[PDB]
Amino acid sequence: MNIFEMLRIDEGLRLKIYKDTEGYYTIGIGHLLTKSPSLNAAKSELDKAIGRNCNGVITKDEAEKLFNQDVDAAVRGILRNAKLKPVYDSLDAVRYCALINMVFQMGETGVAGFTNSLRMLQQKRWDEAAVNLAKSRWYNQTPNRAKRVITTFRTGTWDAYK
Numbered sequence: 001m002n003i004f005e006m007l008r009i010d011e012g013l014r015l016k017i018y019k020d021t022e023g024y025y026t027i028g029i030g031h032l033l034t035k036s037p038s039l040n041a042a043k044s045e046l047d048k049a050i051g052r053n054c055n056g057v058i059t060k061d062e063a064e065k066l067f068n069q070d071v072d073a074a075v076r077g078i079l080r081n082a083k084l085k086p087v088y089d090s091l092d093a094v095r096y097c098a099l100i101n102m103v104f105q106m107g108e109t110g111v112a113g114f115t116n117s118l119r120m121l122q123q124k125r126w127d128e129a130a131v132n133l134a135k136s137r138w139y140n141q142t143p144n145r146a147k148r149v150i151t152t153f154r155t156g157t158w159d160a161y162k
């Protein structure tokens with residue numbers, strides 16, 4: 001297991017524009033296209049992203065291409081965020097995948113806002129962190145995935161993904 005296999009499981013793979021859990025136009029492996037209620041706006045973002053008129057549909061290779069850019073974007077984000085960097089740097093490789101995951105899902109600023117959980121994570125107070133992480137809209141809106149990510153932070157193993 002690694003970050004890609006992990007997000008591939010949580011995000012799924014769909015080659016036609018669809019709406020995500022929040023109701024936002026998405027494609028491939030959780031590649032958010034836009035927060036706009038307009039499908040044409042989404043379609044424009046799509047063609048811009050791919051570099052061709054996709055008419056709302058892309059290939060598997062294309063989905064994976066956007067996926068790698070996105071994963072990478074999430075990490076670079078963490079690395080450049082004054083609040084996220086120290087945590088990320090303090091964690092072992094398994095646990096940081098849980099952090100990338102959150103960022104991929106809710107954005108840098110979003111996660112950077114989990115002040116209390118971040119500190120507990122940095123402090124390596126695993127069970128306590130896991131409890132604090134769950135007192136969140138995130139956990140309540142996507143409980144099963146949040147449980148996987150949280151279990152990952154708590155144990156530092158890939159159990160929740162097997």
Ligand SMILES: [Cl-]
Nearest residue numbers: 134135136137
């Ligand atoms: Cl809550």
Ligand SMILES: [Cl-]
Nearest residue numbers: 142143144145
């Ligand atoms: Cl879920």
